[PDB]
Design a protein around this ligand. Structure first.
Ligand SMILES: *N1CCC[C@@H]1[C@@H](c1ccccc1)c1cccc(C)c1
Ligand SMILES: *N1CCC[C@@H]1[C@@H](c1ccccc1)c1cccc(C)c1
Ligand SMILES: [Cl-]
Ligand SMILES: [Cl-]
Ligand code: NA
Ligand code: NA
Ligand code: NA
Ligand code: NA
Lengths: 228, 7, 6, 228
């Protein structure tokens, strides 16, 4: 890796500088280098990793959607350029999935980190599914579901129902069901069950945790209103 | 810095 | 449908 | 080069799609390929080329300023990363200056294109000057001045004082005087005489040309009232 000769601590420092400079491709490359050192990530570090790649893939997804919209309205140039952006998006998703499989998920030292990474795996397969077709899409969808489901199983056993990571996983898994897997019934059931089981415990939470949890509950609610 | 032509 | 914003 | 097998018209079309998708690195690469076909750019195509590279170097300049400020307030990591961004910025400026010198700047042009490209040459040397130090800075500063001055001489002989390209050149040359060349009196004098000479000829213009000209006049006045 291009970052193999740089100290782990220097890579983390430069990731934070890149964030300040809004250089998210650099930030992602620095965080990739830090992951490839082979050590576990702290909570702050895996948030840096997530933010960096979300900004990168988010820009590619938005560009892909612009180009796909022009293509659908409509020579080969629009399709060609959409395919170029698509291939770059797939490359970034493959890179993130590679970090998670080699070896962030298996090395995660606590349930919260494990769930965080398995959710991320589901998310990046989901981003692949948005642009995939045919048999590849079907394989990708099954991979996304399996990752999300493993995260669900762990979060149910190890995390309280108001935990923000558990809630965020349920949010994204239910979006997967509705938007990708054409399973609106599963999306609604998952969001509803998650919402109810969190609501039961809101009174046990501090002021800040209550705000955190109801924030994501409202995200579940917005999706339920769209869906129901 | 002073602003230059925005295009 | 929107996903988690972070 | 990676664009050599693509049709000129397809490159221009994809530059326009890249602009819609706000993919300015791609846009610049497509326009570079179009320039390398060896045909003169139209007015519209010159604007595509300029917008593309403006946005690329604009992001690099903004990041450089962030990192330089952090470095000034302050291990080698900040300097290393500022130097990385600086080198990439210089690489883009060298690319643009290379296109101008190898393909676009000619003796036998229409005044509009000759002034456009010499102004651009001045701008990209000015961006190099922003990050240069010492005597190296001195030669870069004189290269910017020489390009702006040649553009000014042509613009005063061959274009009316309301011409928007002429006005934008005067605006940027005045910024050069103020910000780079330590000549605020010359900056102010140039902005004032340019504004006043355009004002006096607005009565010759249609509604459309009047809007084009007065928008740049307003920028000149903004800088004058900032500076005085
Ligand atoms: N600025 C220099 C050349 C390209 C850009 C101008 C432009 C862009 C796109 C179409 C037409 C012109 C421009 C844009 C905005 C303001 C000015 C003064 C110039
Ligand atoms: N989203 C998942 C991991 C990173 C991002 C969360 C986050 C980013 C930066 C610092 C802390 C956390 C995040 C951000 C905003 C809202 C939520 C629900 C999560
Ligand atoms: Cl392409
Ligand atoms: Cl670096
Ligand atoms: Na075409
Ligand atoms: Na060719
Ligand atoms: Na003329
Ligand atoms: Na003033």
């Amino acid at each position: 890796g291009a970052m193999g000769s740089m100290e782990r601590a220097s890579l983390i420092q430069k990731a934070k500088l890149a964030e300040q400079a809004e250089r998210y491709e650099d930030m992602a490359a620095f965080m990739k280098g830090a992951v490839e050192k082979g050590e576990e990530l702290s909570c702050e570090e895996r948030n840096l990793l997530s933010v960096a790649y979300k900004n990168v893939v988010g820009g590619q997804r938005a560009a892909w959607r612009v180009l796909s919209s022009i293509e659908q309205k409509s020579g080969p140039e629009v399709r060609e350029y959409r395919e170029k952006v698509e291939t770059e998006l797939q490359g970034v998703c493959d890179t993130v999935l590679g970090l998670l499989d080699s070896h962030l998920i298996k090395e995660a030292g606590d349930a919260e980190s494990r769930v965080f990474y398995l959710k991320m795996k589901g998310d990046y397969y989901r981003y692949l599914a948005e642009v995939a077709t045919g048999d590849d899409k079907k394989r990708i969808i099954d991979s996304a579901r399996s990752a999300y489901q493993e995260a669900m199983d762990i979060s149910k056993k190890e995390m309280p129902p108001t935990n923000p990571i558990r809630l965020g996983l349920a949010l994204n898994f239910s979006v997967f069901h509705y938007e990708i897997a054409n399973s609106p019934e599963e999306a609604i059931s998952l969001a509803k069950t998650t919402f109810d089981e969190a609501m039961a415990d809101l009174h046990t939470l501090s002021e800040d945790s209550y705000k955190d949890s109801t924030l994501i509950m409202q995200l579940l609610r917005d999706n339920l209103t769209l869906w129901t | 810095r002073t602003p230059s032509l925005p295009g | 449908t929107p996903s988690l914003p972070g």
